[PDB]
Amino acid sequence: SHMTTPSHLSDRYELGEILGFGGMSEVHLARDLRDHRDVAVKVLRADLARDPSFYLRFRREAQNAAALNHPAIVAVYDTGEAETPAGPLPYIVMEYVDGVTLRDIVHTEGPMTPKRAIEVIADACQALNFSHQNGIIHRDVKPANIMISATNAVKVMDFGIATAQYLSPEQARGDSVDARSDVYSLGCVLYEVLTGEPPFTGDSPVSVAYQHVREDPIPPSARHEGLSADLDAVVLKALAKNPENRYQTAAEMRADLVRVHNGEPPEAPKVLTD
């Protein structure tokens, strides 16, 4: 009813400006006064925090937020919970990225140049490769979970926690999830940064999930100008319905992105349009 986010958490983190929000959390820039470090603190949203479902969900996700050490992955530093007069306010402390999500880039700027999109997604592949080698499937690859920093570094975040626009067909069906599910979802992001649109939209998540399972994506070159057939092949391989027909690893996907960036033919099956 009237929870508000305090100016200090746990007498160590002094909150500065609000950076963003999502369906659960509000993310603030903060100063870690103990380590003299600027950090991002993800706090359960004040307007949701007294709602038992949301509180409990936040706690279940905080204890599963994967802590990986890689230049393209947002580090997770700590978790905690502030006592306030309105009740407990749980939070996660993570690496601060001064930058913009791919969601916000596509919204405000439209599609990226193809070379830039290739570069960003190839860097995201490195993050995912590292995660997979450490036994962690991301599970929630989407444009909001990839940022480009002010120094043009790619940062992927929010790994390992178990919208419908970016789910893999196997997630839509409740089947087993593995590295190829992250490939598919990253293929959805690639599709969107190239064309300005996700592959599938609909009036409900049931309708969007149905499309992931049953309907072929419109080839990117048909959705938007300046896109090559070689890029169609790479994107549509990532988006193959059967996991066995996708890139089997994030590294394999990267290798094809690197070919296309260099004007070399990709290994992905050719796609013909008219």
Ligand X SMILES: Nc1ncnc2c1ncn2[C@@H]1O[C@H](COP(=O)(O)OP(=O)(O)OP(O)(O)=S)[C@@H](O)[C@H]1O
Q: Is 115 annotated as a binding residue?
A: no
Structure tokens at 137: 């499937």
25 binds Mn ion (CB under 5 A): no
Q: Which partner from the list Mn ion, ligand X, none does 119 bind, CB cut-off 5 to 8 Å by kind?
A: none
145 binds Mn ion (CB under 5 A): yes
256 binds Mn ion (CB under 5 A): no
Alpha-carbon gap, residue 234 to 248, rounded angstroms: 13
Helices (H), 10-113: 52-62, 102-109
Rg (alpha carbons) of the chain, rounded to whole number: 19
Q: Which partner from the list ligand X, Mn ion, none does 128 bind, CB cut-off 5 to 8 Å by kind?
A: none
Residues forming a β-bridge with 20: 27
From the list 123, 140, 158, 230, the catalytic residue is 140
Residue 116 neighbours by CB distance under 10 Å? 15
The verdict on whether 203 is a catalytic residue reads no
Give min distance, CB of 265 to ligand X, in A: 35
User: What is the per-residue burial (b if ≥16 Cβ within 10 Å, else e) of 37-58?
Assistant: eebbbbbbbbebbbeeebbeeb
Q: Is 160 annotated as a binding residue?
A: no
Choose which of 26, 61, 158, 170 interacts with Mn ion (CB under 5 A).
158
Q: Which partner from the list Mn ion, ligand X, none does 23 bind, CB cut-off 5 to 8 Å by kind?
A: ligand X
Binding site for ligand X (CB under 6 A): 19-25, 27, 40, 42, 74, 94-97, 101, 144-145, 157-158, 163
- Which residues are known catalytic residues? 140
